[PDB]
Each structure stands twice: as structure tokens, then as C-alpha cells.
Write an enzyme that holds these catalytic residues in place. Sequence first.
Site, short mmCIF file in Angstrom:
data_model
loop_
_atom_site.label_atom_id
_atom_site.label_comp_id
_atom_site.label_asym_id
_atom_site.label_seq_id
_atom_site.Cartn_x
_atom_site.Cartn_y
_atom_site.Cartn_z
N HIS A 55 -2.54 16.94 -4.65
CA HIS A 55 -3.93 16.85 -5.11
C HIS A 55 -4.80 16.08 -4.85
O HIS A 55 -4.55 14.75 -5.54
CB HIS A 55 -3.60 16.72 -6.54
CG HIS A 55 -4.58 17.14 -7.45
ND1 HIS A 55 -4.32 17.88 -8.79
CD2 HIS A 55 -5.98 17.14 -7.29
CE1 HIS A 55 -5.47 17.68 -9.61
NE2 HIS A 55 -6.58 17.46 -8.59
N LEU A 58 -11.05 15.24 -1.28
CA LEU A 58 -11.77 14.58 -0.27
C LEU A 58 -13.15 14.51 0.02
O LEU A 58 -13.88 14.06 0.79
CB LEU A 58 -11.08 15.09 1.03
CG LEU A 58 -9.71 14.72 1.11
CD1 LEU A 58 -8.74 15.19 2.61
CD2 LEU A 58 -9.22 13.25 0.89
N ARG A 59 -14.07 15.09 -1.17
CA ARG A 59 -15.53 14.97 -0.81
C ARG A 59 -16.07 15.47 0.36
O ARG A 59 -17.50 15.65 0.38
CB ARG A 59 -16.35 13.76 -1.42
CG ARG A 59 -15.50 13.40 -2.62
CD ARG A 59 -15.25 14.40 -3.89
NE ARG A 59 -15.17 13.79 -4.93
CZ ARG A 59 -14.40 14.37 -5.94
NH1 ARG A 59 -14.06 15.68 -5.81
NH2 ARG A 59 -14.15 13.83 -7.08
N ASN A 89 -13.07 22.02 -4.84
CA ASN A 89 -14.28 21.91 -5.73
C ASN A 89 -15.35 20.91 -4.93
O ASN A 89 -15.85 19.97 -5.40
CB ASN A 89 -14.06 21.20 -7.13
CG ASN A 89 -13.28 19.71 -6.95
OD1 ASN A 89 -13.61 19.07 -7.76
ND2 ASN A 89 -13.04 19.37 -5.85
N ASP A 147 -9.46 24.03 -9.68
CA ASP A 147 -9.21 22.80 -10.33
C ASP A 147 -10.49 22.01 -10.04
O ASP A 147 -11.23 21.87 -9.20
CB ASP A 147 -8.15 21.88 -9.49
CG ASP A 147 -8.30 20.50 -10.30
OD1 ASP A 147 -8.06 20.49 -11.67
OD2 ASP A 147 -8.30 19.41 -9.53
N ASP A 306 -4.32 13.16 -7.39
CA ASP A 306 -5.68 13.63 -8.23
C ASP A 306 -6.56 12.77 -7.69
O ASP A 306 -7.53 12.23 -8.63
CB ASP A 306 -5.46 13.77 -9.72
CG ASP A 306 -6.79 14.28 -10.15
OD1 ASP A 306 -7.01 14.35 -11.55
OD2 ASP A 306 -7.62 15.03 -9.65
N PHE A 324 -15.87 11.61 -14.18
CA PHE A 324 -14.60 11.40 -14.57
C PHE A 324 -13.68 11.34 -13.23
O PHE A 324 -14.22 11.91 -12.22
CB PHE A 324 -13.91 12.67 -14.96
CG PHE A 324 -14.34 13.00 -16.48
CD1 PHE A 324 -13.66 12.56 -17.56
CD2 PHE A 324 -15.69 13.95 -16.72
CE1 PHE A 324 -14.01 12.91 -18.99
CE2 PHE A 324 -16.10 14.19 -18.18
CZ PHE A 324 -15.18 13.58 -19.34
ZN LIG Z 1 -8.17 18.56 -12.72
ZN LIG Z 2 -8.49 17.23 -9.67
#
Ligand SMILES: [Zn+2]
Ligand SMILES: [Zn+2]
Length: 426
Positions: A55, A58-59, A89, A147, A306, A324
Site C-alpha cells: 500500500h 506514489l503521487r 487514487n 482506496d 499506506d 490526511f
Molecule cells: Zn485508505
Molecule cells: Zn491509502
Amino acid sequence: MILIRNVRLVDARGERGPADVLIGEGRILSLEGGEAKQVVDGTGCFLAPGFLDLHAHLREPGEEVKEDLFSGLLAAVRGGYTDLVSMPNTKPPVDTPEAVRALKEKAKALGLARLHPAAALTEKQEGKTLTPAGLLREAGAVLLTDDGRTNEDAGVLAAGLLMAAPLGLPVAVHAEDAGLRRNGVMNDGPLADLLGLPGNPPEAEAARIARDLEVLRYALRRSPATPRLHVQHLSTKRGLELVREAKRAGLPVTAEATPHHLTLTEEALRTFDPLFKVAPPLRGEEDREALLEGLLDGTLDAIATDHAPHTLAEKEKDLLRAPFGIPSLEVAFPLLYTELHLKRGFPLQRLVELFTDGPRRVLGLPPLHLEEGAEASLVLLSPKERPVDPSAFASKARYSPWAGWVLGGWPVLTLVAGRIVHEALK
Ligand SMILES: [Zn+2]
Ligand SMILES: [Zn+2]
């Protein structure tokens, strides 16, 4: 070709050595020594199979200023990872074969950690239309996840599991019931009230996990193939209990835990410092303690970072406006080796298993062991103690909730199929 002398060997099977390890031709040639021009004195150190992170954000593409494959995959090898799973994401989300191929091509040209990319479960991760999993897998996707986003429509998740089952693609979920979470910035409870902050009920996580386990039973019934559900960052005691019972019941579900949920608690928010603002929130000591037990009994299959980087400036906004996220690629292992193994007596082989075999099995990949003939994707850990120094990070996020923490167990050598991708022998 390299020779590492007088070093301990540690993989999921146990601790062995000291031994002299000969590496060459991209494999572990011998565990009984040999001849090499490059000799590393591994006294006091231990060798482990290269780590694999399930998880990491890496932007890239879209937010390279926060991170990119250049800084992210470098940070990965410095953290001991030879394999990494990127989250989808991004801007825009990774939901097409071409986007998956682009990431994989760049990761191959860079030749540091192995990229195994994840793709969205639904287009643009908007939770309405399933993505073309078949084509995504063909392009190289190893798992599907929305995610960042939660999966509010149980029907979509169910259909998603059915689409994924025959492809062998696990479906990883960010299990939080948005309805009950509302717009909580930290863990809900007495502390949240004391600090006057909107709380995110830990029950919001338990509620979604409970729901998803029943949805998984639906997939089991309806699918000819065995579906795979992976619960991402699990942070609560109740959530852990749910997963433990599901496993006891034989359900094909797996779970991961992050470095921060294993070492930090809601207490860290008494300063309103955004460095501790994460999703799901840091929980209570009781939750953290339960997770540690979950790591031991096997309920938790892996430790996943994460890794969610942002710019220092963004993390300097007011708590309510700050993003976050916590970055940890480069400190994950030393952090847990220090806080769990050294200070709490947590078994080393089990800790290493959680960074290797565990993650690999979640993806359905064969385990990588320290044995003659095995692929030489390894990492050498040193007992030397040094503080977490953000200014020295390869990651672009030059900050850390563990900044200043004196840790041992830092990687001093990382090899990908025999190639030196990181070296800090000192
Ligand atoms: Zn998450
Ligand atoms: Zn995440």
C-alpha cells in the site's frame, strides 16, 4: 557478485547463521561461503528477503510535487523494499490499461523497486461503474481498489468481487462507513470531546468491515472461482475481531496494518498537529495493543505502509484543513524492528514474514526465501541506531511523525536480483 560474511539469515521459516552468503548471477549461489572481490562484513547484521509493500501512494501521475516514481521507488529501496504496489487514487485515477503500462514502463527504466501496480475498482474511483479488470490485469495490475475512497454501494463491491475472482485479482477496500464517519478528523471518543474536534467513530470501520464480510459470503456463493477480499489499513480491535472470526470461518479474507497504527495512538493529537492526521485515524492504546496480538496470531497477514505523502506546507495548515496522511516508506521497517522486536520482544522471523511472505501471499505471488538458488532480491539490516532525519529522506515529503526517533534496524544494502539499488554500509 558479492560475499556477505558472518551474517544472520532471517526469513519466515526462521533465523539461521551466522553464515557467509555468496551472491552472483542474480541469485544466492551459496550459504556456505565462496570467493568474491566484493566482500561485506555483515557481523551483527541480518539478511532478509526483499520487502514488498502492499500500500503505497506514489503521487504520479498528477501530483508529482508531493511524490513521484523517482523519489518514491528510491525511498522504497532505502526502506528495504524490492517490490511495491502503487495505489490508484492519482490525478486522474489509474483505471485504464495504458495508465498501468505507463507506470510499469517507467518503473522498469528506473531499475529500482519492482512496481506492481493496483488499478481502480470503479472508473475514476467514483464507485458507480466497474473498470475493465480483464484488460487491467493483462496490463500488469495486481489488485483492484478504490482506496482513498470508500465503497458505499454494496452491490458494486459485490459485482466487483465477482469480476475479480476468476482473474485472481484481490479486491482491497478502505473499510469505513462514510455515513457514520461523517467528517471526523480524529478518532471519536472522550479525547475527541476533550479536544473539541469532530470524531470519526471506530465503529464506522467495524460497521463497514462487518458488512463487507457478508458481501464476501455472497461472492463465495455466486462465483465459480474463489474471490479475494483484502482489508486495508485495519486499525481497530473490533475490526480485528471481525477478521479473526471470518478467517476462523474459512473466509478468503486478508488484512494489513500500518506502521502508524502499530506505534501511535489518538493521544498524539493533543497538539492538533496535522502530522498525526490520517485515515483511518490513530486509535486507542487498546486498539494498538490488539493489533500487535493480531500480528502475532496471524489474523493480520501483512504490514503495509499506506505511504501517503503531501507537501510540508499542506501539513502546516490548521488541523481541520490539512490533508490526511503519513509517509513511512523509508522508516517502516526500522521503526517496527525497534518498537516491536527490540522493545516488546516481538519475534524477528514473524516481523520479517509480515514484510515478505505475508504481502506476497496476499497478491498470490510465491514466497521468496533465503535459500541457495533463490532470486537475490534481499536487504541487509544493521543494528546501528540513528535518528529519523526527514531532511535526509529520498521521499519528497520532508517531515515525519517519527522525526527524531532513534531507531535500529535500518537497511544498509538492498539488492534487486543481485543488483545493488541501495547501499549505506557505514
Ligand atoms: Zn485508505
Ligand atoms: Zn491509502
